[PDB]
Every structure is written in C-alpha cells, then in structure tokens.
C-alpha cells in the first residue's frame, strides 16, 4: 500500500469537515456529528491499486495565513471545496484559494468539489438565497469554474445523504497516483 496525502481546502461553511467525517466513518453520524476532524488514514483500493490515503482538514485555519500553509507539505491531492447553497463561496475559489494552493502545492492535482448538492432541492435554501438576489450553484457554473482554475476535474456530493462521497475519495486517490 503506497502512502498518499489529501488536503481539503475551502471557506468556513463549505461542509469540508462533514465530508471528511462521513467518509472516515462510512455512515452519516446518527447521534452526534463531531465539531472537529483530527486526521484519518484511509485504506482505499482504486482500479486495483491499494493506497493508504491520509485525510487532512484546514477548518479553523482560514483566518491564520501563516499557520495554514503548514498543512500543505507533501500534499499529493487537493480537494477544493465550495458549498452549492452558497454562490459566494464559489466566487472566492479563483481569487483566494487557487492562488494559494498553486503557490504552496505546484503541479499538485486539484479536484473542485461542490458540497451540499441536496440543498439544490431545498425550499428554505431557495427562498433564503432569493432574498439576496441569488440561487444555488448550477452544475454548469461549477464545471465552468473547474475549467477556469485548471482543476483536474469537477465533482459534486452530499455528506448528508452520502451520495457521491465515495466517488470523490476514490477519484482523489486516482489523481494522487498520477505522476
């Protein structure tokens, strides 16, 4: 089993901690969802290759521009996260997270991930967004952003329903293997 490293980056309420918890537990926490994520080493087997995948979060470091880059050394794949119920989090991707991720992690594959895709069919979400002259992030808007930032690919998921969560991490493993 080769050891590869994954780091998930993104704004505060993009659901990156929830995504890492749901994958590292295999199910959605039925009693209590932890506030924090320490680390986890995944035993993923993708396309016949056995890989050990270290999972790391950057939650709580978005305000500390000198502590944050310390999660980047030896990163093999970057999960660039945004929330589908927050068009503003997608707007910050090209001008805040992309310049930093490319500076500290050159030549490292970035997968743009749209979290909370379930909320695209949530009435409260569509009403709350409409009051601020907005709507949930469309699939083509997310795809266009990955195209623009030079991302390796674009994926969507929902940690609440576990839908697409496994495919993101199996694809992140594939991306980390490419040399």
């Amino acid at each position: 089993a080769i050891r590869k490293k994954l780091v998930i980056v993104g704004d505060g309420a993009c659901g990156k901690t929830c995504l890492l918890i749901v994958f590292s537990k295999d199910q959605f926490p039925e009693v209590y969802v932890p506030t924090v994520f320490e680390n986890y080493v995944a035993d993923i087997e993708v396309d016949g290759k056995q890989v050990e995948l270290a999972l790391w979060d950057t939650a709580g470091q978005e305000d500390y521009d000198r502590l944050r880059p310390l999660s980047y050394p030896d990163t093999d794949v970057i999960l660039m996260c945004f929330s589908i119920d927050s068009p503003d989090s997608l707007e910050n991707i090209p001008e805040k997270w992309t310049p930093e991720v490319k500076h500290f992690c050159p030549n490292v594959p970035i997968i743009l991930v749209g979290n909370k895709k379930d909320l695209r069919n949530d009435e409260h979400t569509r009403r709350e967004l409409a009051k601020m002259k907005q709507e949930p992030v469309k699939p083509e808007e997310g795809r266009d952003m990955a195209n623009r930032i030079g991302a390796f690919g674009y994926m969507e998921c929902s940690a609440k329903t576990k839908d697409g969560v496994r495919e993101v991490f199996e694809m992140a493993t594939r991306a980390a293997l490419q040399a």
């Binding site: 009693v31 209590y32 932890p34 506030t35 680390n39 500390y64 000198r66 502590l67 310390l70 050394p73």
Partner: protein
C-alpha cells in the same frame, strides 16, 4: 493514555457515554452542550496521547537505540517536552472538573455545568504567554523537522529500520512522525471551533455564557499572536 481515561472517553458522544436512564432525565439543550464538552476533553486526551507518542516512542526511542548526531533529535521534535507539560496540566484540570461532576455511585454519569472559568485560566496570564511562545517556536521549526526527517530517511537505513519498527502497531496507523507534527500544529486552531459550539448551547446561565464568550476572545487573541510570531526556519 491510561485505560481509565480511554474507557471514560471510548463512546462516540456524551449521550452514549452516560447511562441511558441518566440521559433520559435531562433537557435536550443540556445534552447538546455536554456532547461538545465531552468532545473537547476527548480530543485533548488524544492530543496529550500524540505528544506522548512523540516523547516516549519516537524521541526517546531514537536516543536509546540509534547513533544520531547531537541536536538532530531536538530538531525533529522541537518543544515536545514543554508542549507535553502544558497539555497534560490542561487535561488534568478537564478530567478533574468531570470527576467532581460525577453522580455519587457512578463512574460515567456527569454534567459539567462550569467550563468557562477553566478555559479563562488556561488561555490568559502566564499560561497563555507560555503557550504563545511554545506554539510560535513549534510552528516556526515545523517545516525544518519535516525536512530533517526526510533527510534522515532518505540517507540512513538504520533510521528506516527504526521507523518501520516503532510505527508497525495498528494503533499508530495515523501517528507517524510527520503526522504527529501536523496534528500538534493543527490542535490550537481546533479550540475556537469547540468553544463556539459549547457557547452556542450555554445560554441557560448568564454567568456561563459570559465566561465562554470571554474565553473565546482569549483563544482568538492567542491564535492571532502565535500566527504573527511564526517565521519559518530553513535548515
């Protein structure tokens, strides 16, 4: 970590750690507050445990089995003794506040009603000053330690033998040398997330909502100070 604490913090939540009959006669908001409190202590146990893996397993192990140059082991594990003293004292205070809150006749049924005071003493005064200096030093020496470990691994086959040996147990899967360093670095940034979610469910007593609000500001001031004090050191 000791078995007593491992079992007291084995459950995935406070609602699962206490007896269900004890949980039953408690307001939903109390359960929500206790769950985040239980998590702050549970992660502090794991943090102190990570520091014991660095000091006793890795750092001591190299000193007693290998022939490394003087200053090399200190460069790999900077401030691990001082960090261990800080967090083991903090954990001691957290575990004592929980033990005092135990129901007579029980070893699992408790409700911690006052946490903010404990957090204020920890993140203020000389104890805050010592964490600020210890985390500014640790994080400024972080990159150098990772490069020094990779240099030792990609040049010494007696070091690879030692690393393969000590990290072989299943319990150290996510606790290699480099993982331990990032786990310690990220620890400080977890506290504001924990304290804010405890504060979120601590509006019942105005004395407690104020203590936790003060402590949240104290932690954020410490984090801002550590952030400013960092300047990466290259070998």
């Amino acid at each position: 970590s000791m078995e007593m604490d491992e079992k007291d913090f084995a459950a995935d939540s406070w609602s699962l750690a206490v007896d269900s009959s004890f949980l039953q006669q408690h307001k939903k908001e109390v359960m929500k507050q206790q769950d985040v409190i239980y998590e702050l202590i549970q992660t502090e146990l794991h943090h102190v445990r990570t520091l014991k893996i660095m000091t006793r397993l890795f750092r001591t192990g190299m000193l007693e089995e290998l022939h490394l140059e003087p200053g090399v082991v200190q460069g790999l594990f900077p401030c691990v003794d001082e960090l261990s003293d800080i967090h083991t004292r903090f954990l001691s205070q957290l575990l004592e506040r929980r033990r005092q809150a135990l129901c007579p006749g029980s070893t699992r049924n408790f409700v911690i009603h006052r946490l903010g005071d404990l957090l204020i003493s920890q993140f203020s005064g000389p104890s805050a000053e010592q964490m600020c200096k210890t985390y500014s030093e640790f994080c400024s020496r972080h990159s150098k330690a990772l490069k020094l470990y990779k240099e030792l691994y990609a040049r010494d086959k007696r070091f690879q033998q030692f690393i393969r040996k000590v990290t072989r147990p299943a319990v150290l899967k996510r606790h290699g040398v480099q993982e331990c360093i990032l786990l310690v670095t990220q620890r400080i940034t977890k506290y504001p997330l924990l304290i804010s979610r405890i504060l979120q469910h601590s509006h019942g007593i105005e004395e407690e909502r104020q203590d936790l609000t003060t402590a949240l500001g104290l932690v954020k001031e410490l984090l801002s100070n550590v952030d400013e004090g960092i300047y990466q050191l290259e070998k």
